[PDB]
């Protein structure tokens, strides 16, 4: 996994292109995606 650097990605069927970083948003344990007010994917969880 690479951070702070524009990359392409696929996470467990989530497909998208973006700039991954570390975050502070406490995701729900049983959750998977974060999202945003326009519904566009705003975060993820690294299953490994």
């Amino acid at each position: 996994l690479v951070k702070n650097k524009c990359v392409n990605f696929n996470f467990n069927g989530l497909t998208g292109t973006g700039v991954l970083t570390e975050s502070n948003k406490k995701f729900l344990p049983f959750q998977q995606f974060g999202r945003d007010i326009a519904d566009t994917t705003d975060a993820v969880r690294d299953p490994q």
């Binding site: 007010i37 326009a38 519904d39 566009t40």
Partner: protein, 48 residues
């Protein structure tokens, strides 16, 4: 003059309060900002 000064000074004071509490006066400006940020959503949803 004096009386006219006080009536003016005090009358300024209300404008703080009238703004400080009641949130309706700015509806206009508050309306423009919405409808712009409104349409963008309604614009972006279309991508779904």
């Amino acid at each position: 003059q004096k009386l006219i000064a006080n009536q003016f000074n005090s009358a300024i004071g209300k404008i703080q309060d009238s703004l400080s509490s009641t949130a309706s006066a700015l509806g206009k400006l508050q309306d423009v900002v919405n409808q712009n940020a409104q349409a963008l959503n309604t614009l972006v949803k279309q991508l779904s």
